[PDB]
Ligand binder design. Sequence first.
Ligand code: NA
Ligand code: NA
Ligand code: NA
Lengths: 288, 275
Amino acid sequence: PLDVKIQEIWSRSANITWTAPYSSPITKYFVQYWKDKAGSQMLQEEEVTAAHSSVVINNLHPGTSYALTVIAENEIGHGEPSETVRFITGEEEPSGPPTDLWVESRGPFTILVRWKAPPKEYWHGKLKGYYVGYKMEGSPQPYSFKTVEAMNVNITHEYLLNSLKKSTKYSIVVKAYNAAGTGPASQELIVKTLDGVLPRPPSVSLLSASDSTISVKWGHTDEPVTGYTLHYRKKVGHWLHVPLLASDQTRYTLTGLDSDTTYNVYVTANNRYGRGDPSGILSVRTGD
Amino acid sequence: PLDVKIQEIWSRSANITWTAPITKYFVQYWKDKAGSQMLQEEEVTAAHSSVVINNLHPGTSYALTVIASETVRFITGEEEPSGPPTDLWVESRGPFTILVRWKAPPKEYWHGKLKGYYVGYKMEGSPQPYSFKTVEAMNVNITHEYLLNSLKKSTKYSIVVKAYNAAGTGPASQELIVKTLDGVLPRPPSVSLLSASDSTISVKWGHTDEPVTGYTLHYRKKVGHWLHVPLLASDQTRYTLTGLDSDTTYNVYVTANNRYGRGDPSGILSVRTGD
Ligand code: NA
Ligand code: NA
Ligand code: NA
């Protein structure tokens, strides 16, 4: 038919509109529609009598791009007017929370939150951003929320909470949102700010591994650091402790290890007031 | 701290237990996944021989240490999956059968290792409850499938799939409404991509019960109108489109026709030409 229009759109429905085409008279109207993404899709079809200039398509997925064609079939079945349109269905609120919530850095006044986006299939509409809420753990007050950009092209998302109190436990949640509304919140993350007295946790990273050895490095930490302690253990085994008197030290190579064995490794910094909070704990398998 | 014990486990909690022959007790715990994790810590009095850790993730494996030293491992209790299966795909393969396929929900939403899936189906046009069938989890595989059979012909069915684990059942996928074939008109060919070039696209489909009199190949640009290539030849089972534009996305699908008329279409392909 000529002048095919999507007259109105819902999140799961769309009303299609056209005008009577060139007439051999029209036997029926044939409506095809399918998802407009890459890869093979289902070709949905639906008939309408020649007396109708309209139809409502139902059971569509929200926030999804569709292509649709109306065909005016003929007696002759030849040269039958066709026209294809493209549209996107209305939005619905995200149905899944962000995942893999993660603390990256910490200070006495700041907390760096990171998270991965909920899977695209649960967006039901392109995300407009995220809400990061936080509160002190033992407080009746509600969460106070901060707005973050969606950055939908990035794998990782992050936000730095600041102007916090020292040595305080905060509860953190993240929600995604789009034009329709807000999705569910992630599970509570309970994070304690530093004290500003003990050393900050080092940033430990894997340097090298072999059949018998593992090497790791970390950045120097901020009252003068008097030393570091490296901790390690087999996945089935007790913790062992390598004391590093040297504060020039930012590297260490474990030796005499077992082949094809997973070791855990983390580092702590010490100053005159005692041992600071630990790094992330690494999982490294002995190899080449 | 001798003989550390996980005395009991919940889905987000765990009670830890020990004896010790001291300043304080120091309780470290972390997720037992690969890659760098967060080392969570809590302190407890010297007067306590036990502590309850809170706000753990369900269906998650943890390692734990108590220091006055000794490290144990456990897995938190299960919770029901919180997401439905994705990428639902059903084609009426016959007048009596429908083959359903789906991808698993993202593992972050399992909250416990999946035991399988439930495939529910019912006639659309009459008020009925869904009748559910059990399928194995096959968590190793990327794609999952179930062939619904013993159906009526030329009937519309409503299809849903759910994941489930030891805690219970996850939410269902949105309805897929699919109609079984009539057993008269040709069954929809199964068309797949062979090759693409800057100027061409080549596709294939399966060979043949009533003798097929011909095929029609339909194609169009992502922005454009449908074009129809009639193939009265029923022998070859392949075709190569020519004269296309470079770096352009084309839709393609194939219909078969016999004495009774034109059969239901293929799946619709989306193929982009090379540079
Ligand atoms: Na068209
Ligand atoms: Na501290
Ligand atoms: Na065109």
